[PDB]
Amino acid sequence: ANVRYYNTGTAPMYKVTPTTNLVLDGDTLSTIKAQENQIGNNLSPGDTYPKKGLSPLALNTMDQFSSRLIPINYDQLKKLDAGKQIKLETTQVSGNFGTKNSSGQIVTEGNSWSDYISQIDSISASIILDTENESYERRVTAKNLQDPEDKTPELTIGEAIEKAFGATKKDGLLYFNDIPIDESCVELIFDDNTANKIKDSLKTLSDKKIYNVKLERGMNILIKTPTYFTNFDDYNNYPSTWSNVNTTNQDGLQGSANKLNGETKIKIPMSELKPYKRYVFSGYSKDPLTSNSIIVKIKAKEEKTDYLVPEQGYTKFSYEFETTEKDSSNIEITLIGSGT
């Protein structure tokens, strides 16, 4: 097998030894602890072993000292010759870290990372950013309230993200290397435990925002920035210059001061978006008379939707569609309707 590692987070790790696991169809071929061949000396964070310019890394043996190549019986050979694919996973990763003396020399001997895992995990919560260029997973310490003796400062979600990645509080919002991470402009995926807690904590507060709700102990939160963003002050990163642009009070929110009838149009070719996927489309609300948004892209569903605003209150919404496969055709979305 040919394979290269990666790294993400905050810290490096020396003398890494992954234990991998193979699976064909429900079964298990073998799980191999890494021998001395494919051991990795260093992993600087945000990189890969080996580096960007070389071949990947091969493993072929299973013993303690490397001999006795990995076996497969006859029936699984007939399964594999049919053209099926086998899958490769990790179970655990051990290594060491770097400690020093009082301005002495760095010693890395028995400073195992294996024993510091479960002590950290049951204290923190997990936050994973997914940008379109890399990824970022972090663990942030939490506060318990059933025990009064467990002193620690409690903070909210919007400060936890602020300290997780180094963000600059510009104009009440915040950025991360000049990308807008707002409550408004990012896609927030939770799971049922997390969502069950936070939406049942929202009704107790006056301000119905989700960045300023209180942290808890065990949570797993994923954030993801979109690709195509339509901020009306600046930064509409778009090859499609918008049709019938309204220019009246387009700062952020508080600027609901364009109420127009008619349609607007966007047409996007396949050269700048990647095919074969199920995109999501999200937005906020208003109090117009009526509207619809039409999708006319083939090899998918090409119907439209009902707008159906309950109030003026800025209510998000999300739909989905599928892409074509690198054709000459462009995905065209129209926004028809009277009122805004």
Binding site: A11, P12, Y116, Q119, I120, T141, A164
Partner: protein, 79 residues
């Protein structure tokens, strides 16, 4: 003295700790004032009832200053 009774030997002052924050200067933790975000200085607090408030084996005074490693990401200096 009176405002220097640290419980854990985290080498940090509990008066500097429960309050608004503490800042590293000349490898000594000092109090915090509000004219320091113009310089690039941060602000952070923790719990003084523990020697390792986060879990990773670096202590509080170790992690507040830059005295442990250089390849550690700079996003992980507050405890």
């Amino acid at each position: 003295w009176e405002d220097e009774d640290l419980d854990t030997d985290n080498d940090n002052i509990p008066d500097s700790y429960e309050r608004n924050g503490y800042t590293i200067k000349d490898l000594i933790a000092v109090k915090w004032e509000d004219s320091f975000a113009e310089q690039g200085y941060k602000k952070y607090v923790s719990n003084y009832l523990e020697s390792n408030t986060a879990g990773d084996p670096y202590t509080d005074y170790e992690k507040a200053s830059g005295s442990f490693d250089k390849a550690i990401k700079t996003e992980a200096r507050d405890p």
